[PDB]
């Protein structure tokens, strides 16, 4: 009943160019969190990959959901959370994140970015995914 992964990834070729990767390992132990973390990213990269930009993707898995929100430039962001985390707040979260990606550096500066990763990071997408763990974080 909480968000497990957040991030951003530009739709590349076979997979999504990992823009940024943030995880939430609350229920997963020290050893489990590692395996689940890989599960999160691989799934987050897949969504951005299956998301052909300008569209949204909510991947319903037998454990959690994988919300997705793409921009009209070429680089989209992914938001993977439990089914008990509506798409509306994920919309708000992926709203600040996508707009946040455009701010950290001009829209064209990245323009898909043939080279990105969690290295760049984003206080927004990170602090959001961390606190958003709850039902929605709809300004409460």
From Swiss-Prot:
It is a lipid-anchor. This is Synaptobrevin homolog YKT6. The keyword rRNA processing does not apply. The chain holds residues 1 to 140 of 200 of the full protein. The keyword Cell membrane applies. Its EC number is 2.3.1.-. GO terms for molecular function: palmitoyltransferase activity; SNAP receptor activity. Signal peptide: none annotated. GO terms for biological process: amphisome-lysosome fusion; autophagosome-lysosome fusion; endoplasmic reticulum to Golgi vesicle-mediated transport; Golgi to endosome transport; Golgi vesicle fusion to target membrane; intra-Golgi vesicle-mediated transport; intracellular protein transport; vacuole fusion, non-autophagic. Keywords: Cell membrane, Coiled coil, Lipoprotein, Membrane, Methylation, Palmitate, Phosphoprotein, Prenylation, Transferase. GO terms for cellular component: autophagosome membrane; cytosol; endoplasmic reticulum membrane; endosome; endosome membrane; fungal-type vacuole; Golgi apparatus; Golgi cis cisterna membrane. It is found in: Cell membrane. Residues 7-129 form the Longin domain. It comes from Saccharomyces cerevisiae (strain ATCC 204508 / S288c). Transmembrane segments: none annotated. Belongs to the synaptobrevin family.
């Amino acid at each position: 009943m909480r968000i497990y992964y957040i991030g951003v990834f530009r739709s590349g070729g076979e997979k999504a160019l990992e823009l940024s990767e943030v995880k939430d390992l609350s229920q997963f132990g020290f050893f489990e969190r590692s395996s689940v973390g890989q599960f999160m990213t691989f799934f987050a990269e897949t969504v951005a990959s299956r998301t052909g930009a300008g569209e949204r993707q909510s991947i319903e898995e037998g454990n959690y959901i994988g919300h997705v929100y793409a921009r009209s430039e070429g680089i989209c962001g992914v938001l993977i959370t439990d089914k008990q985390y509506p798409v509306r707040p994920a919309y708000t979260l992926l709203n600040k994140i996508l707009d946040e990606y455009l701010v950290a550096h001009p829209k064209e500066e990245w323009a898909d970015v043939t080279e990105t990763n969690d290295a760049l990071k984003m206080k927004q997408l990170d602090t959001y995914i961390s606190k958003y763990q709850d039902p929605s974080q709809a300004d409460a």
